[PDB]
Design a protein around this ligand. Structure first.
Ligand SMILES: C[C@@H](c1ccncc1)N1CCC(NC(=O)N[C@H]2CCC[C@@H]2Cc2ccccc2)CC1
Lengths: 536, 279, 1133
């Protein structure tokens, strides 16, 4: 005679447990069944569980707070908004409340974004991760794409099953030239989320909130690129570049290696998103919008200094465009980076990927390479010499991104980069009419200055034959393929043809399964060879 | 060089000692030391941190233990320190940093029973952020409008709400961008409630207010349920239908914020008991 | 049971597809009717879908299908009551077939016209008007078939039976248009019936006019009229407010006496219906008693009885808010004290009961209930009843209801109010009060982040109620215990009248700072309920004075405790009293003269309206606008009325702010009352206290001999505490020590401290001011401000300036001390120049005190400062006036304006300075801000009354434009002061066309306000012998009167105008009745037009031959069936 509704009181009782161990396991149990309950005839019980877990954000146990963040990320708020709209006595609660539950508002603002100011960096990382997951599942009224939550829910069901079965010089990561066709609903949800996170950034009195808000914004620029979702990042756009560049030119924010490298990625992403509209066809002459020139100039100059510091730290030498001695703030950053690398020197955790000095150097080289797309030979040709000198110092520590940075310089030097190459819907629509129209339409169509690179190039060739990192190895072939594409004769690179022999001898291990990650390097190896079939 | 670090060490030592009246003064001494070396970001942080300590002391004496004998004396020193850092930030550029500090001072003033002073600082922050961050300026302006309502400056709040609506349409359009849509909804409801409360004559009825009122005689970015109730409220007020306003006041309660609910309560109260007769 | 969304997607989608299939197949009419009779509610809700749009379009093209559509809606119209759902229903019902016009027309009026949503009500009227339009524009016999004669009669009778006939005139006229196509002397007995027709109705449209109607009835019949059932109980509060205005004017008010005795009778009568035995209200489980909780359900669940409680509470709250200043015989009778306490509890329980079984109550109803609870707990007579043992359940019920109401408004589900041997209700009430007291910091702190969930009209009410509730002996001892002490190892045995008489906290617990801060918060917030409690905390704080953060906190806490004894009405009650104020400005002799007395009358009206919209109501908790009062006792005592403190309050104190200020009490007040040459407040001996700190502080800071030289944090607060405590000193010797306490400490303390100097300088200056400011003391303290004026620490400079204000207040400065005046006077100008137009970017406090001492220096010692300083200041404070709201905050603007008003009123101002300040009284009248314009109106009134055809003409024009381009609140105030303004400075001939002319203009937005102005002006000439004047100006203006662009405005104005020019006592008395019916042209308005017209044409006229001119003017526009002709035919015979 057992009834399924008998653990709903049992789950609520264990949620308010005096022991943090039981409370964490009670939140995990809620996580398993919260979405199924909201999708069933017991929807009022699933909605009740959402209300009861909201009090866990004040728990002293960090594992409980992260469990709550993971639990709420599972919740689809298009379904919750539908249940909220037709719930009458559940808005009152146990004390006859006079307003509305506003579960999405409280989860988004009082939990997900509120926990971005947590003292534990682990809780901030989970809160940021749960923010990206929630963005596609948020519902707001007066939306062009979905008037009511029922249409919003039906959109997701029909977007997978009714998806019609059909099929059909390299710009850097954060650039998008062609006009993307973005979802208007997704633009609105992203725009609302970004504004809420942006508001907390300036109105922040704690370092933790600033650290967590920048990390969340940086992750949003990766999941939802600024160049693709231009309308979701405020009115092509830059959004909050000056918002973030203020923290870069601060006294305490740069000293946090985790948040400093997150701001660098976000700052470069925002500027790169305005590329097609801010190019033309002085300093930085490719930028048609002169309002962004100081923004690009400040970011570009900042990166060279932090790269110089990493070069100084790696070469353990005590402290013109990348000079940092005459700035006390950059001197403070050097002491932080010096200590972090000194820790790395005396350890042997080769498989560690969360190390801060290496990640910061990777991020600094990542953004510098991205910024080089909006550059011309005129405005960098005078400053290409020390950057190549800087890359040599950091090549041994991060050879993968140093090669990427070298490639971007070659594009700018040879005029290859982007800067040098430029010129009502309801259920009926989503469920039947739009899929039918697309399907029937497809049926109808069925009837019918270089010599400076050479010291840094031979290092890549030398390191290719001595490493087991396929990511670095496949990056070298990309550089080598680009050099051949730039009509640089292969005789200058492989003087004795010792590199090509190494590549050919690598196939013996590849085709007997003795190469650990041969699948990653094969596409680049063969493209490099077919490019070499023309060179004589 | 060395004096600044020692003063900073003294400031944090007294902070752990909870003698922050002198710790913030020590944090002002290091700011003077930073002035001798012209360390912009260093001086800004020192003046900023000293201000937060001064805000805490005023908050401690006005929120934690609400001592009657307090007369906002730590607040005066906080404003001088925050104002200096705002001035220093502006001189070396960074209008956003100075505007953020103005928001911090305004937030403290609002939370210490000084809405009129807080509204002025919130408007100042919006002006600084407007050239670069229209969205941040609208948020600062929204805080100013709330402060003006706290200070019972209804026409002052109406001017701010009208300004925010005009800026949101200009910088966020057609159809809004989502983030600006929430601003437009807040302005549209608040302006109608304020216009119904004040009831400007045709001489004072600006074209911006007249166009908005004509819309309520389509829905834009306002929900249909709220738009119809807002339409009914305007007609009920103009026809002096007291019973309709009472029914609508209850019905619109869950759909409005507490700030908007207070404005609706004032509209109903003014309809039944008009002000200005002396009785 | 919210169901499944996936089921709903199929449910709506299948209906959409089925409608599309029917649209393709109209040959078969079986599935078409199946959808209409089974899914019309779903068809309407899904009518925005393209297939459903065509399905409805297909139905509208078939007469039979349309007939099923109408019949189905009528069967399911109850579900179609949501404004969104009803909006879609009308959209589908607009394009319906012509042959079904009769059926849809019947549906519109019967079930859809009467709705609280006016936008939908007019939508129905528009559609119904259209349906009749096609009905009479089509074949006659077909139209008769659609509308049966009985149906055509029934549709009209229901329109007349309800109010919809007058609300929708076009529809009824169209209904009538279709029908014919298808075939006495106004005596006292007449007056009473008119107010009977208006006051004996449940209409709240015109309560101000309604209150004035009963006010004019004979006083003997007043008791019978209001006490008689079916009289509007909503008129009780306006009657008390209107009656209060007469009492406040000294005249005995029969209306207030009648309303008061009716309000108490109804309050007691309501209590009789309550159950005999009272139980604590339980919002959770109101079922354990059977009869008791059922007796509340049939009481609070009665619509007629429930609606009476808030409207009765409105009158009671209006009565209790003025009972403090009432005469002795109008006070609250002791016999009704118990009934009111029961009534207050019942009203709060009813609001909670309405909350449980319905939605939130009306905001006016909720406010009225909390208004009574807040006001009742402030009266000592009523508080003693609720605090007694007999009313222990009532006190618990108030705590339960207040906590329940607050949580139902501010606390969302899943949230808590605080974000991190005896009956069970006794301890639960104790915990509820402690929780609510903690909520005064975040949840109920106005302007706080956590207060965003509470509307601003509830925060001041709940704060005052909670503090009053926390003072109850039931929960007072428990509430004073810090929560941190409870979680520690403290658990005594309570025992007393209720079993909750906890002892005071042991001193050992207060050693920890975190619990001492909580303890200081509780005693400061709630005060002390008795002298014994005051001595308990006084000894408790003294025990803490035996690491130094505790020492600093205890000194600060002692300062507040002693300072709390100065609050005037009740010393220890923060919910009732504010700190005593003794203004340094003496009463103005410019008033109380033959023209000053009239100035006070017209300025007092303006002053009352300024207070209503500019002041922060710190000492006022309820919403009542005209309840401003200042804590200024008569130290000849009782509080001085606000009307007697016109411009005496300190200019540096913002309007309505009652917090402590450095110049709180004048040295004049110290001399008068203590008999000092240059005490037991509410039964508390502060002489022993004040002398205790003096000796304690003297040994605390002065002696540098023993060990340690007490730290720098502690020294500053001692001088701050000594400065504040000095306000309560009584003997000059106490002032001698406090000077000598600081004299050496100035020289034993290094001068490299600025936080220290900010308190030392004003205290020594204040001490010297009382001590005499003689030669020996003048020199050392004279140098003290100069070394402090050049400070990097701004509060040290204003505090020093505040000391100069003390120094030169009334102690005549020695002629050797004349060097101090220029150093400050030039500083008064040096620092004001850089901010005279940018006060906003600079500190507000400095400007306020800088402008305050300048007014006092100019007014009291004009010779000490040259004419350059005086002339500049008027110009200097004029540029801040003539500035934008952003460039000058309202507090700074009001301080300068009020100071100039007192400066000009005082005769000490020079002739050149006085005339110069008059010239900026004109530029400041036309401002967007209503309060700045109203404030400058007061300055204009004083600038011109003091000065008494060329300049008065330019001024009365702005008094008429402000009405034409001002808010209704703005115009109502100006129209109230207009009759006296025109009577005094203008001969009756000089401004008479303007009065009548402004009453008739298409540019006039408030004809109702100008009607009273014409009435008062007309009666001001009638009662002073110029009874033939008013008749001459009627015949002149009648020709202009007849040609008014509306016909309704023309007839209404003539009815109003005849009342103003009437000699009968009962005809001049129905002005509010005819003002209330503005814009209406019903029958009663027509008969009212004729009746009041004959009172002029028949009773009093200039001469017989002048009557022909009266007839000739109206004869021009004698329309065939207009009221003008009906007017003509009555006067023909
Ligand atoms: C909660 C409290 C309060 C106190 C302190 N701070 C915040 C809120 N407050 C008390 C006043 C109350 N009524 C009010 O403002 N009526 C205003 C509206 C328009 C007309 C009238 C002003 C006016 C009066 C006379 C002549 C002309 C104009 C609102 C709420």
């Amino acid at each position: 005679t057992f009834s399924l509704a008998d653990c709903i009181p049992l789950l609520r009782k264990t949620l308010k447990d005096e022991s943090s161990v039981t409370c964490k396991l009670a939140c995990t149990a809620v996580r398993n069944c919260v979405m199924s309950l909201c999708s069933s005839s017991y929807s009022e019980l699933g909605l009740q569980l959402i209300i009861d877990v909201l009090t866990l954000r004040n728990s002293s146990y960090w594992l409980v707070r992260t469990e709550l963040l993971e639990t709420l990320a599972e919740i689809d708020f298009r379904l919750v908004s539908f249940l909220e709209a037709k719930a009458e006595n559940l808005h009152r609660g146990a004390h006859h409340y006079t307003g509305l539950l506003k579960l999405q508002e409280r989860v988004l603002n009082n939990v997900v974004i509120h926990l971005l100011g947590d003292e534990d960096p682990r809780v901030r990382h989970v809160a940021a991760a749960s923010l990206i997951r929630l963005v596609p599942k948020l519902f707001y009224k007066c939306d062009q794409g979905q008037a009511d939550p029922v249409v919003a829910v039906a959109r997701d069901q029909s977007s997978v099953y009714l998806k019609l079965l059909m099929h059909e010089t390299r710009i850097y990561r954060g650039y998008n030239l062609l006009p993307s066709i973005t979802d208007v609903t997704m633009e609105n949800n992203l725009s609302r989320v970004i504004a809420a996170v942006s508001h907390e950034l300036i109105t922040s009195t704690t370092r933790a909130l600033t650290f967590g808000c920048c990390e969340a914004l940086c992750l949003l620029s990766t999941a939802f690129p600024v160049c693709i979702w231009s309308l979701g990042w405020h009115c092509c756009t830059v959004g909050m570049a000056t918002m973030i560049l203020t923290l870069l030119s601060s006294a305490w924010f740069p000293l946090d290696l985790s948040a400093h490298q997150d701001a660098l990625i976000l700052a470069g992403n925002l500027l790169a998103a305005s590329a097609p509209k801010s190019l033309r066809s002085e300093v930085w002459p490719a930028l048609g919008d002169r309002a962004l020139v100081p923004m690009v100039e400040q970011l570009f100059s900042h990166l060279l200094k932090v790269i110089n510091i990493c070069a100084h730290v790696l070469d353990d030498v005590a402290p013109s465009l990348g000079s940092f001695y005459h700035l006390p703030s950059y001197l403070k950053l050097h002491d932080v980076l010096k200590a972090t690398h000194a820790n790395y020197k005396v350890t042997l955790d080769l498989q560690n990927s969360t190390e801060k000095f290496g990640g910061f150097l990777r991020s600094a080289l990542d953004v510098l390479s991205q910024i080089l797309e909006l550059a011309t030979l005129q405005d960098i040709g005078k400053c290409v010499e020390e950057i190549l000198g800087y890359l040599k110092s950091c090549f041994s520590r991060e050879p993968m991104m140093a090669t990427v940075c070298v490639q971007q310089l070659l594009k700018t030097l040879f005029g290859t980069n982007l800067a040098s190459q430029f010129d009502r819907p309801g259920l009926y629509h989503y469920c039947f009419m739009a899929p039918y129209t697309h399907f029937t339409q497809a049926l109808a169509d069925a009837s019918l200055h270089i010599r400076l690179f050479e010291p840094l190039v031979i290092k890549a060739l030398k390191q290719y034959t001595t490493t087991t990192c396929v990511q670095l190895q496949k990056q070298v072939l990309d550089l080598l393929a680009q050099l051949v594409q730039l009509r640089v004769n292969y005789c200058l690179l492989d003087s004795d043809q010792v590199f090509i022999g190494f590549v050919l001898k690598q196939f013996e291990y590849i085709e007997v399964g003795q190469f650990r990650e041969s699948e990653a390097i094969i596409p680049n190896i063969f493209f490099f060879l077919v490019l070499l079939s023309y060179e004589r | 060089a060395e004096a600044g670090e020692q003063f900073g060490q003294l400031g944090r030592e007294l902070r752990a000692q909870e003698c922050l009246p002198y710790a913030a003064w020590c944090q002002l001494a290091v700011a003077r030391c930073q002035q001798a070396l012209f360390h912009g970001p260093g001086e800004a942080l020192a003046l900023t941190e000293a201000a937060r300590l001064f805000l805490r002391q005023e908050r401690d004496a006005r929120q934690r233990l609400v001592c009657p004998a307090a007369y906002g004396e730590p607040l005066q020193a906080a404003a001088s320190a925050l104002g200096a850092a705002v001035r220093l930030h502006l001189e070396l550029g960074q209008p956003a940093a100075a505007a953020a500090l103005c928001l911090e001072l305004a937030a403290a003033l609002r939370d210490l029973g000084q809405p009129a002073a807080a509204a002025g600082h919130f408007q100042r922050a919006a002006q600084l952020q407007l050239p670069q961050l229209p969205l941040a300026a609208l948020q600062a302006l929204g805080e100013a409008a709330s402060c003006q309502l706290l200070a019972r400056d209804y026409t002052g709040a109406l001017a701010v709400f009208t300004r925010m609506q005009r800026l949101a349409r200009e910088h966020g359009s057609p159809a809004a961008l989502g983030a600006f849509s929430d601003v437009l909804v807040r302005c549209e409801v608040s302006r109608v409630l304020l216009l119904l409360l004040l009831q400007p004559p045709p001489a004072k009825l600006l074209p911006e207010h007249a166009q908005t009122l004509e819309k309520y005689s389509s829905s834009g970015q306002l929900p249909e349920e709220l738009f119809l109730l807002l339409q009914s409220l305007v007609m009920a007020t103009h026809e002096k239908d007291t019973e309709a306003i009472k029914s609508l006041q209850v019905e619109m309660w869950p759909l409005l914020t507490a700030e908007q609910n207070h404005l609706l309560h004032l509209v109903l109260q003014e309809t039944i008991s008009p002000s200005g007769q002396g009785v | 049971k919210l169901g499944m969304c996936n089921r709903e997607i199929v449910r709506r989608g299948a209906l959409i597809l089925f409608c599309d299939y029917v649209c393709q197949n109209l040959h078969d009419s079986e599935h078409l009717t199946w959808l209409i009779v089974n899914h019309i509610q779903d068809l309407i809700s899904l009518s925005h879908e393209p297939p459903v749009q065509d399905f409805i379009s297909a139905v509208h093209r078939n007469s039979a299908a349309s007939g099923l559509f109408i019949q189905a809606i009528q069967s399911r119209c109850e579900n179609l009551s949501t404004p969104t759902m009803l909006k879609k229903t009308l959209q589908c019902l607009e394009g319906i077939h012509l042959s079904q016009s009769g059926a849809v027309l019947t549906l519109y009026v019967d079930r859809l016209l009467c709705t609280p949503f006016r936008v939908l009500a007019r939508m129905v009227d528009i559609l119904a008007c259209r349906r009749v339009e096609m009905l009479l524009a089509a074949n006659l016999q077909s139209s008769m078939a659609q509308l049966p004669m009985e149906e055509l009669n029934r549709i009209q009778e229901y329109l007349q039976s309800s109010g919809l006939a007058q609300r929708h005139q076009r529809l009824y006229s169209l209904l009538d248009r279709f029908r014919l196509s298808t075939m006495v002397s106004p005596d006292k007995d007449w007056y009473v019936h008119l107010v009977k027709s208006q006051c004996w109705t449940r209409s709240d449209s015109a309560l101000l006019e309604g209150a004035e109607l009963v006010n004019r009835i004979p006083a003997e019949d007043m008791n019978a009229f209001m006490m008689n059932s079916e009289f509007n109980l909503s008129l009780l509060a306006p009657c008390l407010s209107l009656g209060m205005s007469e009492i406040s004017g000294g005249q005995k008010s029969a209306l207030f006496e009648a309303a008061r005795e009716v309000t108490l009778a109804r309050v007691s009568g309501t209590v009789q219906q309550l159950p005999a035995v009272h139980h604590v209200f339980q919002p959770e489980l109101p079922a354990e008693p059977a009869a008791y909780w059922s007796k509340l359900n049939d009481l609070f669940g009665d619509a007629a009885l429930y609606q009476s409680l808030p409207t009765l509470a409105r009158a009671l709250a209006q009565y209790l808010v003025v009972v403090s200043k009432l005469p002795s015989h109008l006070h609250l009778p002791p016999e009704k004290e118990k009934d009111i306490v029961k009534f207050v509890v019942a009203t709060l329980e009813a609001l909670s009961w309405h909350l449980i079984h319905e939605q939130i109550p009306l905001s006016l109803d909720l406010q009225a209930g909390l208004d009574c609870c807040c006001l009742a707990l402030q009266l000592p007579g009523l508080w003693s009843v609720v605090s007694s043992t007999e009313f222990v359940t009532h006190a618990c019920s108030l705590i339960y209801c207040v906590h329940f109401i607050l949580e139902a408004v501010a606390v969302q589900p899943g949230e808590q109010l605080l974000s991190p041997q005896n009956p069970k209700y006794i301890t639960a009430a104790c915990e509820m009060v402690a929780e609510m007291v903690e909520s005064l910091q975040s949840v109920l702190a106005l302007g706080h982040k956590r207060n965003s969930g509470v509307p601003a009209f509830l925060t001041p009410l709940l704060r005052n109620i909670i503090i009053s509730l926390a003072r109850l002996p039931l929960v007072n001892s428990y509430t004073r215990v810090p929560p941190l002490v409870w979680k520690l190892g403290w658990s005594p045995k309570p025992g007393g009248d209720f079993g909750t008489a906890f002892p005071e906290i042991p001193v050992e617990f207060l050693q920890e700072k975190e619990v001492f801060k909580e303890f200081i918060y509780r005693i400061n917030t709630l005060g002390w309920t008795s002298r014994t409690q005051f001595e308990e905390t006084w000894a408790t704080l003294l025990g803490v004075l035996v690491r130094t953060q505790i020492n600093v906190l205890a000194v600060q806490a002692i300062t507040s405790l002693v300072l709390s004894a100065m609050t005037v009405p009740v010393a220890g009650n923060p919910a009732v009293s504010c700190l005593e104020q003794q203004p340094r400005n003496k009463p103005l002799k410019a008033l109380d003269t033959r023209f000053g007395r009239k100035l006070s009358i017209i300025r007092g009206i303006v002053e009352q309206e300024i207070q209503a919209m500019v002041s922060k109501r710190e000492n006022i908790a309820t919403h009542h606008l005209y309840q401003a009062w200042d804590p200024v006792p008569s130290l000849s005592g009782a509080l001085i009325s606000h009307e007697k403190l016109l411009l005496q309050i300190n200019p540096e104190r913002e309007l309505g702010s009652m917090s402590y200020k450095l110049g709180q009490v004048s040295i004049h007040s110290v001399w008068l009352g203590n008999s000092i040459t240059p005490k037991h407040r509410a039964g508390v001996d502060i002489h022993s206290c004040s002398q205790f700190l003096l000796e304690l502080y003297s040994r605390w800071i002065l002696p540098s001999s023993s060990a340690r030289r007490t730290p720098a944090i502690l020294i500053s607060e001692v001088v701050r505490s000594l400065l504040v405590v000095s306000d309560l000193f009584t003997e000059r010797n106490q002032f001698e020590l406090m000077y000598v306490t600081l004299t050496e400490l100035r020289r034993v303390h290094p001068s490299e401290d600025e936080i220290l100097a900010q308190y030392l300088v004003p205290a020594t200056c204040k001490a010297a001011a009382v001590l005499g400011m003689d030669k020996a003391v003048a020199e050392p303290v004279s140098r003290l401000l100069e070394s402090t004026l050049r400070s990097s620490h701004l509060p040290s400079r204003v505090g020093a300036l505040h000391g100069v204000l003390y120094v030169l207040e009334c102690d005549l400065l020695d002629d050797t001390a004349k060097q101090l005046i220029p150093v400050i006077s030039d500083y008064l100008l040096s620092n004001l120049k850089g901010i005279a137009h940018c006060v906003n970017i600079h500190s507000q406090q400095h400007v306020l005190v800088m402008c305050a001492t300048a007014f006092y220096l100019i007014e009291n010692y004009p010779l000490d400062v040259g004419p350059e300083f005086s002339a500049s200041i008027i110009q200097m404070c004029g540029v801040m006036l003539s500035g934008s709201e952003e460039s000058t905050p309202s507090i700074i603007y009001h301080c300068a304006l009020r100071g100039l008003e007192r400066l000009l009123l005082s005769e000490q101002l020079s002739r050149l300075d006085a005339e110069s300040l008059v010239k900026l009284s004109v530029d400041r009248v036309n401002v967007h801000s209503p309060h700045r314009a109203m404030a400058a109106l007061g300055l204009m009134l004083t600038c011109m009354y003091t000065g008494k055809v060329i300049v008065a003409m330019e001024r009365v024009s702005v008094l008429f434009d402000r009405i034409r381009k001002g808010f209704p609140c703005e115009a109502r105030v100006v129209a109230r002061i207009l009759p006296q303004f025109l009577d005094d400075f203008f001969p009756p001939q000089d401004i008479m066309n303007k009065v009548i002319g402004e009453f008739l203009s298409n540019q006039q937005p408030y004809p109702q306000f100008m009607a009273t102005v014409v009435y008062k002006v007309f009666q001001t000439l009638h009662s002073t012998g110029q009874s033939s004047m008013v008749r001459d100006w009627v015949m002149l203006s009648l020709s202009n009167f007849t040609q008014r662009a509306p016909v309704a405005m023309a007839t209404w104005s003539l009815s109003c105008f005849f009342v103003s020019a009437s000699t009968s006592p009962w005809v001049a008395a129905i002005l509010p009745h005819v003002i209330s019916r503005m814009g209406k042209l019903e029958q009663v308005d027509v008969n009212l037009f004729c009746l009041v017209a004959t009172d002029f044409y028949r009773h009093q006229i200039e001469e017989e031959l002048d009557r022909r001119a009266f007839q000739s003017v109206l004869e021009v526009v004698a329309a065939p069936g207009s009221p003008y002709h009906r007017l003509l035919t009555c006067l023909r015979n």
